[PDB]
Amino acid sequence: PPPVRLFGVEGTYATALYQAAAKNSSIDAAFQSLQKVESTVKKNPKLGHLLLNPALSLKDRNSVIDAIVETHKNLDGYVVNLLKVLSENNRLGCFEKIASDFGVLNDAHNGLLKGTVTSAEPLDPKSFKRIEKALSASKLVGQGKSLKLENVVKPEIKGGLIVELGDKTVDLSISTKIQKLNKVLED
Amino acid sequence: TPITGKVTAVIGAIVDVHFEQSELPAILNALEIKTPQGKLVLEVAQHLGENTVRTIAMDGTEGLVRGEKVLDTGGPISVPVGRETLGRIINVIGEPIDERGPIKSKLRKPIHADPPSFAEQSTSAEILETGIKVVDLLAPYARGGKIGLFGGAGVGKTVFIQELINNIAKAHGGFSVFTGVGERTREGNDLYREMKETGVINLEGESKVALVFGQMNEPPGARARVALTGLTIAEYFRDEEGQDVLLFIDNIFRFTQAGSEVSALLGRIPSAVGYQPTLATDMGLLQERITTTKKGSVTSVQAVYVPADDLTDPAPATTFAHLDATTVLSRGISELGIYPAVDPLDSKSRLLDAAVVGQEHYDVASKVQETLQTYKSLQDIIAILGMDELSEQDKLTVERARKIQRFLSQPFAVAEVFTGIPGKLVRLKDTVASFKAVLEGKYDNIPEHAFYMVGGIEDVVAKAEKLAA
Amino acid sequence: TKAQPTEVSSILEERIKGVSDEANLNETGRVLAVGDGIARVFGLNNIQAEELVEFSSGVKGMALNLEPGQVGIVLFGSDRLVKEGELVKRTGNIVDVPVGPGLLGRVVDALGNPIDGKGPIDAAGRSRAQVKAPGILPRRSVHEPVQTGLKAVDALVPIGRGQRELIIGDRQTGKTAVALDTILNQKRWNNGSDESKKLYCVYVAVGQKRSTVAQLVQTLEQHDAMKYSIIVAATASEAAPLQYLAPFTAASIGEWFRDNGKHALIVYDDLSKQAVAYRQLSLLLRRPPGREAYPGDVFYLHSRLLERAAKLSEKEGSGSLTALPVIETQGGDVSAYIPTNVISITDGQIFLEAELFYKGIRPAINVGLSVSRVGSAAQVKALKQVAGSLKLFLAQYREVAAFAQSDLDASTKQTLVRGERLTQLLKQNQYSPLATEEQVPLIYAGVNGHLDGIELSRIGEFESSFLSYLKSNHNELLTEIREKGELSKELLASLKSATESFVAT
C-alpha cells in the first residue's frame, strides 16, 4: 500500500484518501485543495467551527457541504467524494483532524521532517540555524526528508535543552541528575 | 398516512426502519410494512436518531429485502372488541383465527392503556370458593381477586387451571377470558372443543367466553403483546360492558421470557439472569389493569411457568408482589403423588383469617400447618433414627400428619380423564368439619390409604369398607 | 468516535474514488472480515431475510443479521474453505431443503446431501426450513395407535399419532434403543397396506458419532426396516451451524408426509446436543449468555421445532407426524433449564432410572418420573381395559416401598407381593418387541391377580409359557383380540378362564 502507514482512527479516512488519490496521482492537487478548504474552514469560524457540532441532519449536513463548495470550486474531486463520505458518515469533529492527518501523510510522502527544540527559553535564530545545520550534518538527515524546527519555551524542561525530531531526542534536564543526587544522599 | 421508511436493518424481529421523511412516528405508534405474505405490524419502541426508529415486529420476520417501504398506520394497535369477540379466538392483531369470520367491531381500542387510579380502586373481599378442599382450607379465593399459580407448567398445571375453569367458570355468570400465552396447540384445540361442547362457547347463540390464544411457536415479540391484547379485551368487558370477568393467563412467564429476549436485541444491556430492565414496570402495569375498580373487579388466575422452579428468579418473585393469593404448586408434592400438587406451606391468601373466614377455620388451618411443619421438621430425624425411636407423642403426630397429607388428596373432575378417578368438589363448610375431625383423630382409627385420593370424610369411611374388602 | 463497516479502507477507497462498485452489491456481495464461522459481507442488498447464499467456496449460509451496509451470514461449512473478499452470490431463496417421498431408506445430511450416497435424493419439491405450526383451527385430537412393543410404554404411556411426547433419561444408556424398538414394533403396522397404518419414521441424529450412526444404519438394515424409515444426520463431525439447522430441515421432510394426511413419526435425538450447538453459535455471534449459558431464544427454537408436529384436522387429511424428542438429562436431574423447558412444551415425558437400568432392566422405565399427558385413549381399547388401574398399582408399589424401609401391614405386603411380581413381568430386554394381541393377556393376568400363582423366579417362565399356552389352548381368543380389539364379556371370561387354566399348570 502507498508509503507511510498511519494507524489513525478516523485517520483511516485520511489514509484511504491518501492511497486513493495517490493511485489517481492527484496528491499535490489534493494537498493544495485541502489547504484551500482548510483555509476556508479557518475563514469560516462562525458555524464553520461553531457548527462543526453534531446536530446537523443528513439533509442539513449535505447543505453545509453545498455551501462550502459554493465558496470555492478548488477541490480535488476525490475530496468532493470524500466530502460526501464525511457528510454521510457524519464525520465532522474529526474533520480538521482528517485534514491535518492527510497533510502530515502527504508531506511525509513528499518528504519533510518535523522537529522541535523544546527549551526553557526561546533560543536565538543563530542557535536555530546552527542546530539545523548540525542536524542536517548528522546522519539523521539522509535527504528525501526536509526539516521543521521550532524551538519552544516550556518551563517544564528544567535544565539542559531537548532536541526532538525523528522520534530521536536528546533530552538534557537537571531533574535526572537531581534525582540521582537525592536518592543516594537519603540512602 | 403514507409516511415512508425503508428497512435499514432486520436484526431479528426487531427491525429498524429509517423514516426517510423527517415526520417520524411517535413511540408506541404502529406501522404497516406491506409484504406479499400479508403485512407486518411493527410498533415503534425507540427513536435512535437520524429518523431511524427501532421497531418491534409482532410477526415472524423472514424474506425481508434490505430497504423495504413502510407506511405509518399510527398509534397503539387498536384491536377490535365487542360481543362479536365473544366466541372468537383472536390473533395478536385481533384477526379471528378460529375463522368464525370478521369481528363486527363496535370499538377498536388501543393495546396500551393505563391502570386505574388509587382513588378509583374499589377493594373487594367477597369469598370465591372452588370446592377444592386444599384451596379452601389453605388459601380461599375471592371473586374479582388476583389468583396465582406457580411451578412447572403443563405438569398437570394446565390441567389444574382447566379444573378451575370447570369449577369456577361453571359458577361464574359474567364474562370470562382465557388467554394462553405459549399455549400447547393440541391442548388449546381440546379446550376450544370442550368449550364449544359445554356451550360455554356455542357457535350459534352467545358465548359467555371469549378466547385469545398465543402459541409458543409464534415469535417472542408476538407473545409479548398477546398479554396486552387480551388485557384490552378484558378492559372492554370491565369498563364498557361493565360486567365482572374471569381471566386466565397461561403462562405469564412466557411474557417475561419474551421480554428478556427482545430487550437484548433492542440494545438494552440485560439485567440479572437476563431479564429485561423494565420487568417490574411492565408486570406492574399489566397486573393493575386487572385491578378491582368501581368499574368491575376482575377475577384473574395467573399461571407462572417457574423456570426450574427458581422462584428466586426475579420474575416469579415480582409476581408475588402483584398477587393477593398464591398457590405455588410443588413438583416435590407432585412426586409425593398428591393431586392437587399444591405446596401446602406455600399457598397463601389474605382471605385466610380468624374472622375473615372465622376463628374455627383459622384454628383448623393453623393446626394443619403446625402439624405438617413438625412432620417436615422431623424428616431428617425420622430417617436417621426411625419414628419408633422418636417420641411417642410425636409418633402420633407423624402418623396423623401422614393421614392429613393423604386426606388433602382429592380427585378432580377433568383430572378424571387423566387420573381415571371421578372428581370431587366438597363444600367448604363440609371441609372444615372434616379436617377438624381428622385433627381430633376421630377417624384416625382407619388406614392412611383410606384418606388418599378421596373427597369428604364420609367418602373416607366408605373407602375404609372398600379397603376392608 | 465510532467504527462503521464502510470505514474499511478498501471500501472507503471506492467511495473516495468516485463512488461505489456499480450495483454489484445488490445481488452479489464480497466478503469482508471473516472468522468465527460467520462472515460479514458487503453488498447483497436484495438479500431476502434468511436467504440461502452460496459463497464461491461452495459454503452456503443463511443470512442472520441484516444490518445497514453489511450482512452477517452464518457459514454452513468450515472456516478454512472460506476466504476474505470472496464473491457471494444469492441463491435467491429462503433456506429450503428438498422434500418428497423418496427419502424412505435414505441417509442424508442436513443440506439433504445423500450421505448414504444411494444416488441423488428423489424429492418432489424443496420446502422452507422454518414453517409455522398448525394453529388451533387446523388441529384435531389424536386417536390413532402407536404401539412401541414395550408394555410399560404401551400400557402406562399411551402413544397415538401426531402427538408431542418427550423421551428423557440418562446419558449413554444406549438411549436410542427405546425408539429403535418402536420402529421395529411398527414393522407389521408398516407392513399394513393402509398408509394410515403406515408410519414413516424419521430418525434425526444430532451430535452422535458418525461411526455409531453407521452401525445403527447397518443394524436397521439387519432388522430390515430402513426402507420405511428416513435417517437425517447431523453427526459429531458435522459443523455446529449444520447441527442447528438439522432438526428444522428434518421436520420439513416429515411434513411432506404429514401434509399428505399420511401418518408419520419423527424422533429428534438429541436436542440437548442442539442446545450446545445453539449455545456455540450464539456465543460466537456474541449474543449475551442465557441461563446455564444456553441462549434466551432456546425456548423459542425448541418450541418452533416441536410444535410443527401434529395431528392435522379432517380437512388436512388427519396429517399425523408424531414427535418424540430425546433429551439427555444432565446427570438425571430434570431440574435443569433445557429439560424443564422441554417438559413444559411436551405432553408426557418418559424418564428412565439409572438404578433400574443398572438393576437389570434394559430398558428400565422409571414410572415415578414417566407421565403421559396423552391421557385416556390413544391406544387399543383392549389395552385400555386390561391396563386399567395398573398405573395405580405400580404407584402403590412405589408408595409401599417408600415406607418399606419397619413393620408391614398385610395390605402393604400384599401390594409388595403384587408389585415385585408385576416388576418382573415389566422387565424386557432390548430388541424384544411384543405384539398388541400378546400384550392383552399378560396385563390381564397380573391385573386380575392371577400372577400371585407364579413366584418371582418363575415369572419369566410363566410369561413365555403362558403366551405359548394361550395360542395352543385357543389362539381363537387372541385372534378375537386381533380383530375385535376388545374383550367381549364372553371373551373376557374366556380369557379369565384361560389365564386361570394356565396359572393352574
PDB file of N, CA and C in Angstrom, chain C residues 145-203:
ATOM      1  N   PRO C 145     -53.273 -45.282  16.970  1.00  0.00           N
ATOM      2  CA  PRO C 145     -52.435 -46.024  17.894  1.00  0.00           C
ATOM      3  C   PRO C 145     -50.990 -45.878  17.501  1.00  0.00           C
ATOM      4  N   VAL C 146     -50.075 -45.883  18.486  1.00  0.00           N
ATOM      5  CA  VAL C 146     -48.665 -46.053  18.263  1.00  0.00           C
ATOM      6  C   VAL C 146     -48.337 -47.022  19.340  1.00  0.00           C
ATOM      7  N   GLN C 147     -47.819 -48.197  18.952  1.00  0.00           N
ATOM      8  CA  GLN C 147     -47.585 -49.279  19.860  1.00  0.00           C
ATOM      9  C   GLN C 147     -46.099 -49.419  19.780  1.00  0.00           C
ATOM     10  N   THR C 148     -45.414 -49.470  20.941  1.00  0.00           N
ATOM     11  CA  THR C 148     -43.973 -49.387  20.961  1.00  0.00           C
ATOM     12  C   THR C 148     -43.396 -50.763  21.118  1.00  0.00           C
ATOM     13  N   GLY C 149     -44.220 -51.722  21.597  1.00  0.00           N
ATOM     14  CA  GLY C 149     -43.829 -53.093  21.812  1.00  0.00           C
ATOM     15  C   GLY C 149     -43.248 -53.271  23.177  1.00  0.00           C
ATOM     16  N   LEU C 150     -43.189 -52.173  23.959  1.00  0.00           N
ATOM     17  CA  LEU C 150     -42.679 -52.164  25.297  1.00  0.00           C
ATOM     18  C   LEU C 150     -43.914 -51.924  26.076  1.00  0.00           C
ATOM     19  N   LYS C 151     -44.266 -52.903  26.930  1.00  0.00           N
ATOM     20  CA  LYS C 151     -45.517 -52.962  27.633  1.00  0.00           C
ATOM     21  C   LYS C 151     -45.738 -51.785  28.510  1.00  0.00           C
ATOM     22  N   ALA C 152     -44.691 -51.355  29.237  1.00  0.00           N
ATOM     23  CA  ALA C 152     -44.745 -50.189  30.077  1.00  0.00           C
ATOM     24  C   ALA C 152     -45.039 -48.965  29.271  1.00  0.00           C
ATOM     25  N   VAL C 153     -44.394 -48.850  28.094  1.00  0.00           N
ATOM     26  CA  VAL C 153     -44.529 -47.701  27.237  1.00  0.00           C
ATOM     27  C   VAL C 153     -45.666 -47.943  26.279  1.00  0.00           C
ATOM     28  N   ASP C 154     -46.673 -48.702  26.714  1.00  0.00           N
ATOM     29  CA  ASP C 154     -47.737 -49.080  25.846  1.00  0.00           C
ATOM     30  C   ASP C 154     -48.744 -49.670  26.777  1.00  0.00           C
ATOM     31  N   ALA C 155     -48.774 -49.171  28.032  1.00  0.00           N
ATOM     32  CA  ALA C 155     -49.836 -49.501  28.941  1.00  0.00           C
ATOM     33  C   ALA C 155     -49.755 -48.570  30.102  1.00  0.00           C
ATOM     34  N   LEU C 156     -48.684 -47.759  30.194  1.00  0.00           N
ATOM     35  CA  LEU C 156     -48.581 -46.753  31.219  1.00  0.00           C
ATOM     36  C   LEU C 156     -48.323 -45.479  30.490  1.00  0.00           C
ATOM     37  N   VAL C 157     -47.850 -45.579  29.232  1.00  0.00           N
ATOM     38  CA  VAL C 157     -47.657 -44.428  28.408  1.00  0.00           C
ATOM     39  C   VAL C 157     -48.440 -44.770  27.177  1.00  0.00           C
ATOM     40  N   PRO C 158     -49.597 -44.153  26.938  1.00  0.00           N
ATOM     41  CA  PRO C 158     -50.358 -44.454  25.741  1.00  0.00           C
ATOM     42  C   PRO C 158     -49.849 -43.468  24.725  1.00  0.00           C
ATOM     43  N   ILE C 159     -49.518 -43.933  23.498  1.00  0.00           N
ATOM     44  CA  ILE C 159     -48.975 -43.086  22.466  1.00  0.00           C
ATOM     45  C   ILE C 159     -49.828 -43.342  21.262  1.00  0.00           C
ATOM     46  N   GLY C 160     -50.134 -42.261  20.524  1.00  0.00           N
ATOM     47  CA  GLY C 160     -51.001 -42.235  19.387  1.00  0.00           C
ATOM     48  C   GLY C 160     -50.326 -41.323  18.427  1.00  0.00           C
ATOM     49  N   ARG C 161     -50.928 -41.091  17.240  1.00  0.00           N
ATOM     50  CA  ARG C 161     -50.198 -40.472  16.160  1.00  0.00           C
ATOM     51  C   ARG C 161     -50.497 -38.998  16.061  1.00  0.00           C
ATOM     52  N   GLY C 162     -49.431 -38.195  15.805  1.00  0.00           N
ATOM     53  CA  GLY C 162     -49.489 -36.766  15.630  1.00  0.00           C
ATOM     54  C   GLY C 162     -49.188 -36.016  16.888  1.00  0.00           C
ATOM     55  N   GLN C 163     -48.678 -36.710  17.926  1.00  0.00           N
ATOM     56  CA  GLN C 163     -48.534 -36.185  19.261  1.00  0.00           C
ATOM     57  C   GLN C 163     -47.182 -35.567  19.470  1.00  0.00           C
ATOM     58  N   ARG C 164     -46.961 -35.000  20.680  1.00  0.00           N
ATOM     59  CA  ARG C 164     -45.705 -34.453  21.115  1.00  0.00           C
ATOM     60  C   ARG C 164     -45.472 -35.029  22.479  1.00  0.00           C
ATOM     61  N   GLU C 165     -44.433 -35.882  22.609  1.00  0.00           N
ATOM     62  CA  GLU C 165     -44.243 -36.718  23.767  1.00  0.00           C
ATOM     63  C   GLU C 165     -42.770 -36.874  23.986  1.00  0.00           C
ATOM     64  N   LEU C 166     -42.278 -36.538  25.196  1.00  0.00           N
ATOM     65  CA  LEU C 166     -40.868 -36.477  25.494  1.00  0.00           C
ATOM     66  C   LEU C 166     -40.368 -37.830  25.900  1.00  0.00           C
ATOM     67  N   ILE C 167     -39.096 -38.134  25.562  1.00  0.00           N
ATOM     68  CA  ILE C 167     -38.416 -39.325  25.988  1.00  0.00           C
ATOM     69  C   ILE C 167     -37.188 -38.738  26.591  1.00  0.00           C
ATOM     70  N   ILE C 168     -37.008 -38.922  27.904  1.00  0.00           N
ATOM     71  CA  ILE C 168     -35.970 -38.241  28.624  1.00  0.00           C
ATOM     72  C   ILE C 168     -35.239 -39.310  29.384  1.00  0.00           C
ATOM     73  N   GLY C 169     -33.936 -39.122  29.692  1.00  0.00           N
ATOM     74  CA  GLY C 169     -33.240 -40.085  30.510  1.00  0.00           C
ATOM     75  C   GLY C 169     -31.765 -39.847  30.481  1.00  0.00           C
ATOM     76  N   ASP C 170     -31.005 -40.823  31.024  1.00  0.00           N
ATOM     77  CA  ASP C 170     -29.598 -40.663  31.301  1.00  0.00           C
ATOM     78  C   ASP C 170     -28.696 -41.033  30.170  1.00  0.00           C
ATOM     79  N   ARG C 171     -27.568 -40.290  30.118  1.00  0.00           N
ATOM     80  CA  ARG C 171     -26.531 -40.356  29.128  1.00  0.00           C
ATOM     81  C   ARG C 171     -25.979 -41.732  28.927  1.00  0.00           C
ATOM     82  N   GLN C 172     -25.892 -42.123  27.632  1.00  0.00           N
ATOM     83  CA  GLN C 172     -25.299 -43.329  27.122  1.00  0.00           C
ATOM     84  C   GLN C 172     -25.794 -44.532  27.848  1.00  0.00           C
ATOM     85  N   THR C 173     -27.127 -44.604  28.034  1.00  0.00           N
ATOM     86  CA  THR C 173     -27.763 -45.817  28.468  1.00  0.00           C
ATOM     87  C   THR C 173     -28.197 -46.475  27.195  1.00  0.00           C
ATOM     88  N   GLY C 174     -27.600 -46.042  26.051  1.00  0.00           N
ATOM     89  CA  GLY C 174     -27.915 -46.513  24.743  1.00  0.00           C
ATOM     90  C   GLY C 174     -29.291 -46.029  24.529  1.00  0.00           C
ATOM     91  N   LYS C 175     -29.491 -44.709  24.766  1.00  0.00           N
ATOM     92  CA  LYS C 175     -30.777 -44.067  24.907  1.00  0.00           C
ATOM     93  C   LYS C 175     -31.703 -44.364  23.774  1.00  0.00           C
ATOM     94  N   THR C 176     -31.088 -44.587  22.603  1.00  0.00           N
ATOM     95  CA  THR C 176     -31.659 -44.761  21.301  1.00  0.00           C
ATOM     96  C   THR C 176     -32.584 -45.947  21.265  1.00  0.00           C
ATOM     97  N   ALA C 177     -32.268 -47.014  22.022  1.00  0.00           N
ATOM     98  CA  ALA C 177     -32.879 -48.307  21.865  1.00  0.00           C
ATOM     99  C   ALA C 177     -34.368 -48.299  22.041  1.00  0.00           C
ATOM    100  N   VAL C 178     -34.920 -47.465  22.952  1.00  0.00           N
ATOM    101  CA  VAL C 178     -36.348 -47.386  23.171  1.00  0.00           C
ATOM    102  C   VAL C 178     -37.057 -47.026  21.883  1.00  0.00           C
ATOM    103  N   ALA C 179     -36.500 -46.045  21.151  1.00  0.00           N
ATOM    104  CA  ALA C 179     -37.052 -45.589  19.905  1.00  0.00           C
ATOM    105  C   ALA C 179     -36.904 -46.613  18.825  1.00  0.00           C
ATOM    106  N   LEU C 180     -35.761 -47.330  18.807  1.00  0.00           N
ATOM    107  CA  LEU C 180     -35.449 -48.303  17.792  1.00  0.00           C
ATOM    108  C   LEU C 180     -36.487 -49.379  17.861  1.00  0.00           C
ATOM    109  N   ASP C 181     -36.846 -49.773  19.101  1.00  0.00           N
ATOM    110  CA  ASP C 181     -37.835 -50.777  19.380  1.00  0.00           C
ATOM    111  C   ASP C 181     -39.178 -50.348  18.876  1.00  0.00           C
ATOM    112  N   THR C 182     -39.529 -49.045  18.967  1.00  0.00           N
ATOM    113  CA  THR C 182     -40.793 -48.564  18.441  1.00  0.00           C
ATOM    114  C   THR C 182     -40.837 -48.764  16.942  1.00  0.00           C
ATOM    115  N   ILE C 183     -39.717 -48.445  16.249  1.00  0.00           N
ATOM    116  CA  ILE C 183     -39.597 -48.530  14.811  1.00  0.00           C
ATOM    117  C   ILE C 183     -39.768 -49.959  14.375  1.00  0.00           C
ATOM    118  N   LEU C 184     -39.180 -50.901  15.143  1.00  0.00           N
ATOM    119  CA  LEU C 184     -39.305 -52.314  14.885  1.00  0.00           C
ATOM    120  C   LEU C 184     -40.704 -52.803  15.109  1.00  0.00           C
ATOM    121  N   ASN C 185     -41.380 -52.345  16.187  1.00  0.00           N
ATOM    122  CA  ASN C 185     -42.681 -52.831  16.585  1.00  0.00           C
ATOM    123  C   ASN C 185     -43.692 -52.492  15.534  1.00  0.00           C
ATOM    124  N   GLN C 186     -43.517 -51.330  14.877  1.00  0.00           N
ATOM    125  CA  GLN C 186     -44.491 -50.874  13.935  1.00  0.00           C
ATOM    126  C   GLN C 186     -43.992 -51.277  12.581  1.00  0.00           C
ATOM    127  N   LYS C 187     -43.179 -52.356  12.497  1.00  0.00           N
ATOM    128  CA  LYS C 187     -42.834 -53.008  11.265  1.00  0.00           C
ATOM    129  C   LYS C 187     -44.044 -53.618  10.647  1.00  0.00           C
ATOM    130  N   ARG C 188     -44.871 -54.313  11.458  1.00  0.00           N
ATOM    131  CA  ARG C 188     -46.020 -55.024  10.965  1.00  0.00           C
ATOM    132  C   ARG C 188     -47.164 -54.086  10.766  1.00  0.00           C
ATOM    133  N   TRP C 189     -47.192 -52.960  11.513  1.00  0.00           N
ATOM    134  CA  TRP C 189     -48.071 -51.858  11.218  1.00  0.00           C
ATOM    135  C   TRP C 189     -47.702 -51.270   9.892  1.00  0.00           C
ATOM    136  N   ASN C 190     -46.389 -51.212   9.590  1.00  0.00           N
ATOM    137  CA  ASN C 190     -45.889 -50.557   8.409  1.00  0.00           C
ATOM    138  C   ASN C 190     -45.816 -51.571   7.310  1.00  0.00           C
ATOM    139  N   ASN C 191     -46.209 -52.834   7.592  1.00  0.00           N
ATOM    140  CA  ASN C 191     -46.352 -53.839   6.572  1.00  0.00           C
ATOM    141  C   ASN C 191     -47.808 -53.784   6.215  1.00  0.00           C
ATOM    142  N   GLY C 192     -48.615 -53.046   7.025  1.00  0.00           N
ATOM    143  CA  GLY C 192     -50.006 -52.768   6.785  1.00  0.00           C
ATOM    144  C   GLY C 192     -50.133 -51.971   5.523  1.00  0.00           C
ATOM    145  N   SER C 193     -51.062 -52.412   4.644  1.00  0.00           N
ATOM    146  CA  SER C 193     -51.389 -51.800   3.378  1.00  0.00           C
ATOM    147  C   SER C 193     -51.873 -50.384   3.505  1.00  0.00           C
ATOM    148  N   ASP C 194     -52.749 -50.107   4.498  1.00  0.00           N
ATOM    149  CA  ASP C 194     -53.278 -48.791   4.739  1.00  0.00           C
ATOM    150  C   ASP C 194     -52.130 -47.923   5.177  1.00  0.00           C
ATOM    151  N   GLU C 195     -52.071 -46.677   4.669  1.00  0.00           N
ATOM    152  CA  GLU C 195     -50.936 -45.809   4.856  1.00  0.00           C
ATOM    153  C   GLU C 195     -51.243 -44.892   6.000  1.00  0.00           C
ATOM    154  N   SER C 196     -52.437 -45.087   6.601  1.00  0.00           N
ATOM    155  CA  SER C 196     -52.801 -44.522   7.866  1.00  0.00           C
ATOM    156  C   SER C 196     -52.513 -45.581   8.890  1.00  0.00           C
ATOM    157  N   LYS C 197     -52.003 -46.754   8.440  1.00  0.00           N
ATOM    158  CA  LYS C 197     -51.467 -47.771   9.300  1.00  0.00           C
ATOM    159  C   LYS C 197     -49.990 -47.834   9.041  1.00  0.00           C
ATOM    160  N   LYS C 198     -49.488 -47.118   8.002  1.00  0.00           N
ATOM    161  CA  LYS C 198     -48.071 -46.982   7.796  1.00  0.00           C
ATOM    162  C   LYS C 198     -47.655 -45.731   8.501  1.00  0.00           C
ATOM    163  N   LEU C 199     -46.502 -45.828   9.186  1.00  0.00           N
ATOM    164  CA  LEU C 199     -45.771 -44.735   9.754  1.00  0.00           C
ATOM    165  C   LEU C 199     -44.562 -44.632   8.893  1.00  0.00           C
ATOM    166  N   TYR C 200     -44.007 -43.418   8.839  1.00  0.00           N
ATOM    167  CA  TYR C 200     -42.785 -43.157   8.149  1.00  0.00           C
ATOM    168  C   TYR C 200     -41.993 -42.505   9.212  1.00  0.00           C
ATOM    169  N   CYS C 201     -40.902 -43.137   9.686  1.00  0.00           N
ATOM    170  CA  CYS C 201     -40.352 -42.711  10.941  1.00  0.00           C
ATOM    171  C   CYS C 201     -39.067 -42.069  10.559  1.00  0.00           C
ATOM    172  N   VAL C 202     -38.720 -40.925  11.181  1.00  0.00           N
ATOM    173  CA  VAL C 202     -37.555 -40.184  10.783  1.00  0.00           C
ATOM    174  C   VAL C 202     -36.700 -40.231  11.997  1.00  0.00           C
ATOM    175  N   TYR C 203     -35.401 -40.559  11.852  1.00  0.00           N
ATOM    176  CA  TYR C 203     -34.526 -40.593  12.984  1.00  0.00           C
ATOM    177  C   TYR C 203     -33.600 -39.477  12.704  1.00  0.00           C
TER     178      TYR C 203
END
